[PDB]
Amino acid sequence: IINPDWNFEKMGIGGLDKEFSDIFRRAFASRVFPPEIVEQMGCKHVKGILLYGPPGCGKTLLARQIGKMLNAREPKVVNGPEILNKYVGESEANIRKLFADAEEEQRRLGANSGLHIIIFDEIDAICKQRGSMAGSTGVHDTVVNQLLSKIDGVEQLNNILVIGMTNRPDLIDEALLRPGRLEVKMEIGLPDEKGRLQILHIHTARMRGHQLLSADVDIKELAVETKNFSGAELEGLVRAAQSTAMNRHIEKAESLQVTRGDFLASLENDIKPAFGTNQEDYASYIMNGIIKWGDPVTRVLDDGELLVQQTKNSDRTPLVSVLLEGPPHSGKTALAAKIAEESNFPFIKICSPDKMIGFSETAKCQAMKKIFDDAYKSQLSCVVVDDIERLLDYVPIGPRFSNLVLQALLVLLKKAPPQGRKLLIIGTTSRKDVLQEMEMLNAFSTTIHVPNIATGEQLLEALELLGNFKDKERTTIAQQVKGKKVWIGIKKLLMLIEMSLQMDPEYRVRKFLALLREEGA
Template sequence: MQAARCPTDELSLTNCVVASEKDFKSGQLSIKTTPTQKFVFTVKTHSSVVPGTIAFSLPQRKWAGLSLNQDVEVSVYNFDPSRQYVGTMTLEIDFLQKKSVDSNPYDSDKMAIEFIQFFSAQAFSMGQQFVFSYCDKLFALLIKDIEAMDPSILRGEQSSSKKRKIEIGLLHGNSQVIFEKSESSSLNLIGKAKTRGSRQSIINPDWNFERMGIGGLDKEFSDIFRRAFASRVFPPDIVEQMGCKHVKGILLFGPPGCGKTLMARQIGKMLNAREPKVVNGPEILNKYVGESEANIRKLFADAEEEQKRLGANSGLHIIIFDEIDAICKQRGSMAGSTGVHDTVVNQLLSKIDGVDQLNNILVIGMTNRPDLIDDALLRPGRLEVKMEIGLPDETGRVQILNIHTAKMSQANMLAKDVDIKELAVETKNYSGAELEGLVRAAQSTAMNCHIKATTQVEVDTEKAQMLQVSRSDFMASLNNDIKPAFGSNQEDYSSYIMNGIVKWSNGVSDILGDGDLLVQQTKNSERTPLVTVLLEGKSYTQTLLTLYNVTFPFYITINCKQNHFTRLLVFTLQGRKLLILGTTSRKDVLQEMGMLDSFSTTIHIPNISRGEHLMEALELLGGFQEEERATIAKQVKGQTVWLGIKKLQMLIEMSLQVRCHFLVGIKWIFPPLSY
């Protein structure tokens, strides 16, 4: 083929050779200029190029020593992905024309981003000279060094420290570009990309969960990375050859205070991408017609413009919707509304996955109520990665507490008797926000000890210099200040079991054994994750038994006087292993209402009906002397009694208050027997 002049100035800035569509379509070409010299270029096509010729820009002809109409030998060049992808490329930079010299600072980080987006998937060689347009200025570039990318990066693994030099490489989205101004240049470079670093991945090397204030979410992030970012680690041309489309949306859901918003905000810092746009759901809504939809379009405007300009080489744009359920409710679910919510959902759907769908965006939504969100938004191609951010386990609580006590520990303000692992055990079912609140409460408790409140409030500055937060401060806050919103309420539980379980007959032991079996069935069975049990009997017989030996991480008691069964709780319990215990003293009413069939099994809780069972209960409960119990035994011998264990406990306590006259005590317990 013959060398020709590049047909347009715009094409001459692409660093590509230009050929006719009849000769080549796309890819890389090996161009042999002499028997011992060959150069590798990326090829573009243009209709003005004559078949049989190949067009070069002036910098390309100068570098390769080509003259117009010179015959060259051209062949297709294939890169080896495991050896020839660019990890780091160092460029010498200067103004192309001396008359355009200025003293303005040029940010090398922004310049590197623009460079990679513009030249991604192109071939580069050591010593190559070309021109780069940035901020309406032309810069002359010279390739000083090329290091191959470690193949482990493509697998999402840690990069090895060994560097390998290469002569020819293919640039891609994960390459690192370093600018070094030439010795005689007056160019004013600022930014990190003017120095050599070690970044070769979409993941920022400075990223660390604990340093970013996130703990206990290692597995969740690992799953998010596998689904949402693995395809973005690979070079764009490989992804395009696979026909792979990047994941465009993630939905983070779970109870309040567990780290959804914090994780979403830190994803932008973790990635080598632009600062994410963070939007609170209700901020989108506007009372004027069409403004809410316009607000959605503005969020995606930058990504649309860049994708039109750079195509597959466009950078990643992250848009974060906090409280996304506020704007993406099920369409048609709000009777009598203006329909604004419906049109906002329609607009969002069209931007994420409409006719002109974008492939350079990542939408992250957070909500406590995914059941409210329109189903169309949750299908594959939209918010397809759904990740529950739940309560941290013990290991996660250790991480979170370490994060929030790190500064105190460094400043020697955390007492040595504070055991983070002990606190993690004591804070079962605490959310991340509640753990942070616990640390604040302990700090306040410690500070309060150094405040003197006389006629005016002042700080004892001498003692304050020796301020330390101790174990007792944490325990005081744990007992008095911070309680878990989700989890066992120990205070309610303690009030029910303060007198323990009185096994006044073998029947009570049998019932407790049945309860243990039901608990184990719920915990261990995969075929019956939901077990519903009705405990029925006369008043004051069932409540204690329902809470006996409950070892579940979360339990709640619900009654007609204090109902905490909120819709958020319903959602939180969905899909879990669940044991539901119902109690009633009016089984006949439930039968009339048709509710008995809602329970898997029914257990009858009997009253104390026989004299020997009563005496067994009195002995276990205590309070009476042996002579007194003997007197009561004579009274009840051969008699039929009928009372619940809770009522018996109450009557015993009443009788003890008038113990000075024993027969009066007998009257309190057994009025019919004392006459």
């Protein structure tokens, strides 16, 4: 009896217990069977695994492990192109130099044969869609026109599985992807927490069997505290853990002692950024935090918490859309960030004009589209648009804007992700009237008016909070504000505070109030 796999207990993998089972049944069940029933069946073996996903998610690992540890052969591997050559025909010929040790082998051993494997990698480089390839005719066209000719070729070789892998699967030709040339198109993606901890269990098992690790590390906490890590990142987390321990442990004068890993995640999660959320993106936009000056802030961020809980819980509203109106210099983005920071959804990338400058609207809308397509990977997410009227160019005078970015924006607001996923799209603006005029406002599912500070009462209690002005001088500002109304927003306030502060103390408050006369007026 011939079985190509004597042992795999578990190999180098966690989180994929679905995907490995699917790929296994599809492409190794025909292999592992009684032959008699399969020739009763009259079925031809599936070949042609493809693996498409984002980077750092463990695809070439999988291909490596199956090919070289699961079944008995040595696989021929092309690293990117190895193929291409300066001479015509020899590039193409290297393809058949791959297949020409298994073709005759099948010819002269019949059905039963030792399996041959080919692992392509970065296959999108060698193969791309014809007619759009490097000009009209294309340079890369005959390698692919041979490859298709061989894989399903007239010889009907039955003895190979081709394992491709990509980060850009749309490039790959449907002609090559139809069943039998590559049968299985398999997404592998950012793991869920239980798979995520499996990763850590694996990479820490060899460290755990030995007692170097310290008892204070419960990896479930680490699962909670790295949400989206691909696992290529996660090894790096562990790897730099070991490194910090070693440096703690030591011209060089390495002092020879026995060492223990501890506080890895706590120390260096702050170091490494990720494909998913950051802790640090927030402190840019909220530098001062959010001080509570009244019931308005309660109302606003409670509505936000309420709404994210709606999205999390409910179905038949896969997406929601909100925007925050305020007058200018009434913080919109602070609220919009703190909402997400309290929502604890796993994926947040703010889309802001500030990181896009000088960009023509084409590459602009491609960027926002990239963000939303990244977000559609995860199971749920919160995306912030801010300063919309500057995101899409806007001026009142002879009114002008980019049409393209507008339409891309609001179709995305009206767009649904693949089912089961859920998100909210938060937006900000200082004006919603022009948005009514361009009829994108209806697309936003709901709005929140952010009020602006209306009362010297709210002002002076905010100043109790900030603590910049003490009570003695504040007695004067009380007598100034009482009975009068104020329109100023706090982001302008927080300028006025220091603008007055830098004067001498005697003229301090007099300048402050005489200045504040201008805006309240």
